[PDB]
């Protein structure tokens, strides 16, 4: 999340476009990356 | 005399304080991407990295 915002700041008052992909996509990537993670996780490990 | 030799084991020293303080070097970083306009973000980054 730290290098996301630091990568937006990098690309703002340049290319406003790109940065503000980038940020509507991680809005969606982080929060499904960290649901399936919990989901493996909890998985692998309520099973054994 | 019996005299044994211990070899002290790295993995939980690495896991502990070697790679908390590495990343937080890693994160001290950060401070260059940023514009030099902005006065209080570089100012937070650098005090929460000497703190940490
Ligand atoms: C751990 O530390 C101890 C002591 O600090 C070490 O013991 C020392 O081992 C050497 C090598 O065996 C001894 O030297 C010996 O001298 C006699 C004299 O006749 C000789 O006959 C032997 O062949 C050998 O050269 C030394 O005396 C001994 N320390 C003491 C105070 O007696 C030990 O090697 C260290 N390492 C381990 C794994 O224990």
Known sequence: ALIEFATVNYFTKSQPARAAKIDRLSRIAF???????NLVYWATYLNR | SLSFKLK????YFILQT???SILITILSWVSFWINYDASAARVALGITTVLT
């Open chain 1, 31 to 37: 929060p499904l990356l960290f649901g399936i993670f």
């Open chain 2, 8 to 11: 002290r084991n790295i993995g």
């Open chain 2, 18 to 20: 070697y790679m908390p």
